[PDB]
Coordinates of C-alpha atoms and ligand atoms in Angstrom, one line a residue:
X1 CA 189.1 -9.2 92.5
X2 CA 192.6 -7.8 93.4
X3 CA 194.7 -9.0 96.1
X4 CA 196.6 -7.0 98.4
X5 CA 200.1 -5.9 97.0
X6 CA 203.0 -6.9 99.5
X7 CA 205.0 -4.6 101.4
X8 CA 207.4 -3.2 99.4
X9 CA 210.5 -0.9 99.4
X10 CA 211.3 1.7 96.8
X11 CA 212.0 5.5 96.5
X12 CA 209.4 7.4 98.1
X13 CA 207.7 9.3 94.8
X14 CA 208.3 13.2 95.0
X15 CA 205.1 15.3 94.8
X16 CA 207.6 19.1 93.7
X17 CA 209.4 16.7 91.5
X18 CA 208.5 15.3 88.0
X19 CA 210.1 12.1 87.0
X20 CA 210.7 13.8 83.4
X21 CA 210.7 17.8 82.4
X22 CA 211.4 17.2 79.2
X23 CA 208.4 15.9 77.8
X24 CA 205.0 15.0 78.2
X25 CA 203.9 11.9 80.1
X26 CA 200.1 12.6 80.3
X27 CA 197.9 13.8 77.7
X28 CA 195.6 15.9 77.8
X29 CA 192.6 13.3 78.5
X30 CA 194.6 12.3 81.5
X31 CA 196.3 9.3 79.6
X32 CA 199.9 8.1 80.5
X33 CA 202.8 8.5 78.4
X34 CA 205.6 6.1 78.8
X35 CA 208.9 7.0 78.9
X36 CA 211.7 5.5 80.2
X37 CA 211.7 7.0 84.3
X38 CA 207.9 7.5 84.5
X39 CA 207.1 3.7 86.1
X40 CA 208.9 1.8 88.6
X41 CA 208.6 -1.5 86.8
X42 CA 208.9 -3.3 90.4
X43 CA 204.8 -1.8 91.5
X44 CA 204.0 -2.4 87.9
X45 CA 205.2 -6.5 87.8
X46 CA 203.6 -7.0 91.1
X47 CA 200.5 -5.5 90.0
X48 CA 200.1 -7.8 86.8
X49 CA 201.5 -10.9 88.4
X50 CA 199.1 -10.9 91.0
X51 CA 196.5 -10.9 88.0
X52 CA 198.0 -13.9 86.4
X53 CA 198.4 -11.7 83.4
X54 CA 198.7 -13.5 79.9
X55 CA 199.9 -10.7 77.0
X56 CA 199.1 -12.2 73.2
X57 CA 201.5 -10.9 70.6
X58 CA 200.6 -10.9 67.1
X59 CA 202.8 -10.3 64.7
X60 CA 202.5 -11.5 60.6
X61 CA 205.4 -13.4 58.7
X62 CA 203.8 -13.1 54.9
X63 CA 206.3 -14.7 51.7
X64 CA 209.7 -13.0 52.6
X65 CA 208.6 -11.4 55.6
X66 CA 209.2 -15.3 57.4
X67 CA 213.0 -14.0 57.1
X68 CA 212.7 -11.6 60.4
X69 CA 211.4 -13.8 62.6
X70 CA 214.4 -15.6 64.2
X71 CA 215.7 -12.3 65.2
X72 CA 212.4 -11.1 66.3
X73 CA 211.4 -13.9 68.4
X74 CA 214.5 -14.4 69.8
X75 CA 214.7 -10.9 70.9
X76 CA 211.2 -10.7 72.1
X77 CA 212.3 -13.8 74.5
X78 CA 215.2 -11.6 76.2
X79 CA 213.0 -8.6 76.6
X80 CA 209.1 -8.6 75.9
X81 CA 207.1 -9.1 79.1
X82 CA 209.9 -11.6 80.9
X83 CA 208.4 -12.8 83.6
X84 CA 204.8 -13.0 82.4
X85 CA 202.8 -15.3 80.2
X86 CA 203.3 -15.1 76.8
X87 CA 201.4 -16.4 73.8
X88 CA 203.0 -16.1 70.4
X89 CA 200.6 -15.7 67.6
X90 CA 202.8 -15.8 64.3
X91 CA 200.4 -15.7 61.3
X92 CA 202.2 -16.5 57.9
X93 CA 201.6 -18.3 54.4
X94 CA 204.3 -20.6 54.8
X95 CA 204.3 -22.4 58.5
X96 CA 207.5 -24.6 57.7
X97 CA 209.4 -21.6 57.5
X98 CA 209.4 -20.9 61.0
X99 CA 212.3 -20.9 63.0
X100 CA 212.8 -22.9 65.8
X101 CA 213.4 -20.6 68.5
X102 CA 213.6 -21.8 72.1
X103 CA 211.1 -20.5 74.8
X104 CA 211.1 -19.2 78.1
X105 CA 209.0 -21.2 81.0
X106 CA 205.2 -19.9 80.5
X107 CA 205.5 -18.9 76.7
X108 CA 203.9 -20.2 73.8
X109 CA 203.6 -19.9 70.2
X110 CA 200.6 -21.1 68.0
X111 CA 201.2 -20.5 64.1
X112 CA 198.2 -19.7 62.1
X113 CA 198.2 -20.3 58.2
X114 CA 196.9 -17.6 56.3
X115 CA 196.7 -16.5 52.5
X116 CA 199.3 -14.2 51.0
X117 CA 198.3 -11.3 49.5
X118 CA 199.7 -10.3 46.0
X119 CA 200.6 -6.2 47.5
X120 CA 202.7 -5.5 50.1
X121 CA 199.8 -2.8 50.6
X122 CA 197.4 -5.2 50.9
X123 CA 199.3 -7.9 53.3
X124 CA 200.0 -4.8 55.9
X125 CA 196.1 -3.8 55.7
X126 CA 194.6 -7.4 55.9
X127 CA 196.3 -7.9 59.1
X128 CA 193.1 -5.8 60.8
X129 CA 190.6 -8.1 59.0
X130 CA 192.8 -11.4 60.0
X131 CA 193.7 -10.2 63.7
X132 CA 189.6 -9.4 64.4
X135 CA 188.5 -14.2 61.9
X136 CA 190.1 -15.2 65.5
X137 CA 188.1 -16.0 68.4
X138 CA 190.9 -18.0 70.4
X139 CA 192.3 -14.6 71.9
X140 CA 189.1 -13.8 74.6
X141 CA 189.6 -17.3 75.8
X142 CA 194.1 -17.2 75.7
X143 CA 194.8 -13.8 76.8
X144 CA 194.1 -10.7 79.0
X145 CA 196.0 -8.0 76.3
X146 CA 196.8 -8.4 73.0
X147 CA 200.0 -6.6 71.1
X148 CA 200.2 -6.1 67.5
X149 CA 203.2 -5.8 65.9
X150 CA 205.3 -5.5 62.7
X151 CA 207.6 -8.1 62.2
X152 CA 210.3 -6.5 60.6
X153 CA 211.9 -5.5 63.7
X154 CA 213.9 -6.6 66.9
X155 CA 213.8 -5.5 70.8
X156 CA 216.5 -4.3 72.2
X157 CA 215.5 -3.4 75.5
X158 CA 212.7 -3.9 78.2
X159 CA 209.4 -3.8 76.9
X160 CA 206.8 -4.8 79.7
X161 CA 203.5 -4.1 81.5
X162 CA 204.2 -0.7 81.8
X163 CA 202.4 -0.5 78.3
X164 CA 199.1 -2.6 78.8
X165 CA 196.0 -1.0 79.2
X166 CA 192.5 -0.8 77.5
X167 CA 193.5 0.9 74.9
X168 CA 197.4 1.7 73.5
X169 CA 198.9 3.6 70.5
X170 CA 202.6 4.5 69.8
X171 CA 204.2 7.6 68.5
X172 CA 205.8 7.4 65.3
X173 CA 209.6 8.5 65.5
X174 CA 209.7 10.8 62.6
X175 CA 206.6 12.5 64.1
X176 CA 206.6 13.1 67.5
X177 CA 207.7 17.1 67.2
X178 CA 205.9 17.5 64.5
X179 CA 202.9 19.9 64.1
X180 CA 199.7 18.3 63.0
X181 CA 199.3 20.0 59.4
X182 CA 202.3 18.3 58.7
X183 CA 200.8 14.7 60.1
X184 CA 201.0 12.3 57.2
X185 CA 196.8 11.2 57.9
X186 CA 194.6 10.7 55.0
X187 CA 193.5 14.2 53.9
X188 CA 191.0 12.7 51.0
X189 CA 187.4 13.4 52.4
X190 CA 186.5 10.7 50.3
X191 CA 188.1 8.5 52.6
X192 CA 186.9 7.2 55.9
X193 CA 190.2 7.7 57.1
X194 CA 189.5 11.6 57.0
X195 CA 191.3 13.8 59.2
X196 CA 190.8 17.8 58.7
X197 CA 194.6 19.8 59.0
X198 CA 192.7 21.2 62.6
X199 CA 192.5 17.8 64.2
X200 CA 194.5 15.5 65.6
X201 CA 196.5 14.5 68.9
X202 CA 199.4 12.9 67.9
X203 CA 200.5 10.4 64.4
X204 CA 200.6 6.9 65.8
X205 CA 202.5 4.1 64.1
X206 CA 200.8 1.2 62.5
X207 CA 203.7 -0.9 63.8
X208 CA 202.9 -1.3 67.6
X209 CA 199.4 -0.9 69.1
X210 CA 197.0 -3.0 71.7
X211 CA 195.0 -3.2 74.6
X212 CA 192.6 -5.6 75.8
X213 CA 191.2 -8.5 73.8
X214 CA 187.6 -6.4 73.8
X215 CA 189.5 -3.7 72.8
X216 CA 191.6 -4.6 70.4
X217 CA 189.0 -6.8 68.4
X218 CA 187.1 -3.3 68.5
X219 CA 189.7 -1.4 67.1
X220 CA 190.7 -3.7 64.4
X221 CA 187.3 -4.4 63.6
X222 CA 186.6 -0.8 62.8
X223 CA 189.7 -0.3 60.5
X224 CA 188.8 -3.5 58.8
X225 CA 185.1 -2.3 58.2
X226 CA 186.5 1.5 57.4
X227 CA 189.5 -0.3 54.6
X228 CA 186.4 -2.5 53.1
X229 CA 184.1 0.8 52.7
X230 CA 187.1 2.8 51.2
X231 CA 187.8 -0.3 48.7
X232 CA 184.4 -0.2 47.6
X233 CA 184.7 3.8 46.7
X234 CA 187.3 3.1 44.7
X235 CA 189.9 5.0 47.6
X236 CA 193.2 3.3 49.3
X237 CA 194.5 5.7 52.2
X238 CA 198.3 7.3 51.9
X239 CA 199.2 5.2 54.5
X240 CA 196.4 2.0 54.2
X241 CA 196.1 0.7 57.5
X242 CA 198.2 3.0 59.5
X243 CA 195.7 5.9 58.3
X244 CA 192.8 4.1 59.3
X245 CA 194.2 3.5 62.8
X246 CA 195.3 7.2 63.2
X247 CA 191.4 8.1 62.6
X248 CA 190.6 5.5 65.3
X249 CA 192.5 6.7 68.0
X250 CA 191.6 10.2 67.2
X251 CA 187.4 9.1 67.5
X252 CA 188.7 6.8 70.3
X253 CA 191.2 8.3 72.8
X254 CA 193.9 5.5 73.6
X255 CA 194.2 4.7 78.2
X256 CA 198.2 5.2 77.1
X257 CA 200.3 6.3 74.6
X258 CA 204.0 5.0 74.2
X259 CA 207.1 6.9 73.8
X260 CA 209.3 6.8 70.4
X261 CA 211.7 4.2 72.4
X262 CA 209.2 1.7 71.6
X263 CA 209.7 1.9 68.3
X264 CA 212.6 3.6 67.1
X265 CA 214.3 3.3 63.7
X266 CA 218.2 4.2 64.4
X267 CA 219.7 4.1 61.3
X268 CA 217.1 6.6 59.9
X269 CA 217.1 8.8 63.1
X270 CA 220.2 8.4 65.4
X271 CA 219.9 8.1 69.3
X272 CA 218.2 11.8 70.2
X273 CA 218.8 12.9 73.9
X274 CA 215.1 12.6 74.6
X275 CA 215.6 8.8 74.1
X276 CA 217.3 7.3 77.6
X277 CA 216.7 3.8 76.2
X278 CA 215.5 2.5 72.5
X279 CA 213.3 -0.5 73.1
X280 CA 211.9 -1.8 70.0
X281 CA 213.8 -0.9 66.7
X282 CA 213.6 -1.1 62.8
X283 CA 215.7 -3.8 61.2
X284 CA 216.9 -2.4 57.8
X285 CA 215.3 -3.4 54.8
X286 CA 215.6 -3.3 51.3
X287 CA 211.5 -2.2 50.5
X288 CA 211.2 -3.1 47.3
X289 CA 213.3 -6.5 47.2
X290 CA 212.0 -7.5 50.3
X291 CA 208.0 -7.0 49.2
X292 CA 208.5 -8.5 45.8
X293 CA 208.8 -12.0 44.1
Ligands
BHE301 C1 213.9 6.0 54.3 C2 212.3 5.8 54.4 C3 211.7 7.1 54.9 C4 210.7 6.8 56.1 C5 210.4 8.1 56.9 C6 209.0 8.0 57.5 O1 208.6 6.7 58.0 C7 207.4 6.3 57.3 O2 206.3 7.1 57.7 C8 205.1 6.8 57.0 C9 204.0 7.8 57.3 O3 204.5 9.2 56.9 C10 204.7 5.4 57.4 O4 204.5 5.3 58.8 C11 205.9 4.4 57.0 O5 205.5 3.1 57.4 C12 207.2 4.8 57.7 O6 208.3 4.0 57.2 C13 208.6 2.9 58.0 O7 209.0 3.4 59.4 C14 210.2 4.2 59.4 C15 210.5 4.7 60.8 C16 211.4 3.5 58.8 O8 211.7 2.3 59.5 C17 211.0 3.1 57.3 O9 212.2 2.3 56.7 C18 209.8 2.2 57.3 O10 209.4 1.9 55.9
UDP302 O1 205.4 -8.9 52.1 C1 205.1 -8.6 53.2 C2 204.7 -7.2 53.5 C3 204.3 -6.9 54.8 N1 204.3 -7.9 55.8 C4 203.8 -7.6 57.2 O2 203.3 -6.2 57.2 C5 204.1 -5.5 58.1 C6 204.3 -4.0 57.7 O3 205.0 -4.0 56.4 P1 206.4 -3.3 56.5 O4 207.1 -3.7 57.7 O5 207.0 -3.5 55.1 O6 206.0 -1.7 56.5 P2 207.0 -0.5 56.9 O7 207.4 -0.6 58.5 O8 208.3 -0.5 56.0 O9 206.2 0.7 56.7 C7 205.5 -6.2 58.2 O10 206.2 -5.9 59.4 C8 205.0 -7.7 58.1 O11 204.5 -8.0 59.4 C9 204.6 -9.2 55.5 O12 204.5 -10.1 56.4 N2 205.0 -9.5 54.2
MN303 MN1 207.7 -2.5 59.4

């Protein structure tokens, strides 16, 4: 049950005006798109307050990986879901190695202990199997947040973005058309998608929704990755293939904008971008994922 909201005031919302003419903020199965001017964040708080909202936030730390999450939590502190209730759920083979980093009032942070896998390849995939394994999250949180680690926020990210069901548009693909979509083009692979499908390439870096939902999702990529291992078949892009097929079988409630995650040093600050939210820290690949 939903309480009333309070009287509030804000800009009366203009029918013969769209917030944004630039691009599109609704696909075509009626879903949001969030850009920056699209949600007054005010409505939006009051909304999810009055629901005593807790958002989980997952986010793996596996052998040199543990080095970007000072930055990472410490940014998420100034900027992801202020306001709210927080639970931290940093997975990583070597708990001592994380930082210290001082909370907000209502946030926690639980470390899990995993294995580490031997492939970068197969760390990023196994986070599907290890995020679904967990049964804490129906009972801790409304909405749970997956994210990479090797990143930091530099700008509001909030309940604007929760929802059932939520993917992300990759950066380098958002004008693209979808023949030139990196998916997995291998029939032999359960990540299959035909050059004539397709709404948009989501990134493997940021997606969520509900617990129900979430556990769903990775769930099915887990049980699609452990199918494809069996044939012998890794997809192009491992587990950011096999969520891309998801979310084409399984429409996403919202889609975010490129501002929530942006790589800057790879692609500048284009005009369609009013803020950048949640942004790449630079990386050297093959240092960083080896011994
Ligand atoms: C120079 C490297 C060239 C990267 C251009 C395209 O991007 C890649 O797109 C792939 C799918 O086609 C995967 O999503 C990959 O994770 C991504 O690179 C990641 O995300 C990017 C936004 C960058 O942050 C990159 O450094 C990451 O490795
Ligand atoms: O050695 C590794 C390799 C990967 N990861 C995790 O898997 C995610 C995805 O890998 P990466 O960020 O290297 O992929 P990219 O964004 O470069 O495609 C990382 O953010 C980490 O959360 C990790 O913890 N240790
Ligand atoms: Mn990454």
């Amino acid at each position: 049950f939903m309480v009333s909201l309070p009287r509030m005031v804000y800009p009366q919302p203009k029918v013969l005006t769209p917030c944004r003419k630039d691009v599109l903020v609704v696909t075509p199965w009626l879903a949001p798109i969030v850009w920056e001017g699209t949600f007054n964040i005010d409505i939006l708080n009051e909304q999810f307050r009055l629901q005593n909202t807790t958002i989980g936030l997952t986010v793996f730390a596996i052998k040199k990986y543990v080095a970007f999450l000072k930055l990472f939590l410490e940014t998420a502190e100034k900027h992801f879901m202020v306001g709210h209730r927080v639970h931290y759920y940093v997975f990583t083979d070597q708990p001592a190695a994380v930082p210290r980093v001082t909370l907000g009032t209502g946030r926690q942070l639980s470390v899990l202990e995993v294995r580490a896998y031997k492939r970068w390849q197969d760390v990023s995939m196994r986070r599907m199997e290890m995020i679904s394994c967990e049964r804490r999250f129906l009972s801790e949180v409304d909405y749970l947040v997956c994210v990479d680690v090797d990143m930091e926020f530099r700008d509001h990210v909030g309940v604007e973005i929760l929802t059932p069901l939520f993917g992300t548009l990759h950066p380098s693909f958002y004008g693209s058309s979808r023949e030139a979509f990196t998916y997995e083009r291998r029939p032999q692979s359960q990540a299959y998608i035909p050059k004539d499908e397709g709404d948009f390439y989501y990134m493997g870096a940021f997606f969520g929704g509900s617990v129900q939902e979430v556990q769903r999702l990775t769930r099915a990529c887990h049980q699609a990755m452990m199918v494809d291992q069996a044939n012998g078949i890794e997809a192009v892009w491992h587990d950011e293939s096999h969520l891309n097929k998801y979310l084409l079988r399984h429409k996403p409630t919202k889609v975010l904008s490129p501002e929530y995650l942006w790589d800057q040093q790879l692609l500048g600050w284009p005009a369609v971008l009013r803020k950048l939210r949640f942004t790449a820290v630079p990386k050297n690949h093959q240092a960083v994922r080896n011994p």
